[PDB]
Amino acid sequence: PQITLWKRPLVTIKIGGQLKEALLDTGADDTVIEEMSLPGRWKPKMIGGIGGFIKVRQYDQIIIEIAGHKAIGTVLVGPTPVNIIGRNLLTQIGATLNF
């Protein structure tokens, strides 16, 4: 699809057996999801943006279905105010910004 930017570019994702809404975010290096459990190993990380930093858990090799398209990569889990699909997964679904 061609997604407009007149509104937030929100899509449905499936992660850890759960459906969630998330923002397609070209400004995000990494994918960040609100608190949830995921299986496997994790390690702590700090990520920063407007307003400063939050502590997250870094889970590697997580599959996420994004608007119907599967992709695997690292997912950060923590107290983000919005679920964010970042570049690490946007590349894997072939997303581009066009103008």
Added chain:
Amino acid sequence: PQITLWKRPLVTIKIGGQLKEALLDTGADDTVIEEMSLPGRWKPKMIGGIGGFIKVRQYDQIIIEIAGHKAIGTVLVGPTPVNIIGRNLLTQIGATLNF
């Protein structure tokens, strides 16, 4: 152009006769740039990023070139890890997300 997302989507902007680097950010409703001098009056705005809420200065109707494309619109001035071009100006330059 068609911009892929394997690296950060950084572009040159021109504001106030000066060239700066900025990030094309579909996850940002608004455009936020680092401390600089802009003409005219400003109004207060609170914006909430990943780390919390901050105060910024809102300047309306500012001339700004984004990757060679002219725009005239609202610019927020305040502390940010990088200048971000949000949807208010991405729509003016005709950007969409595609996959």
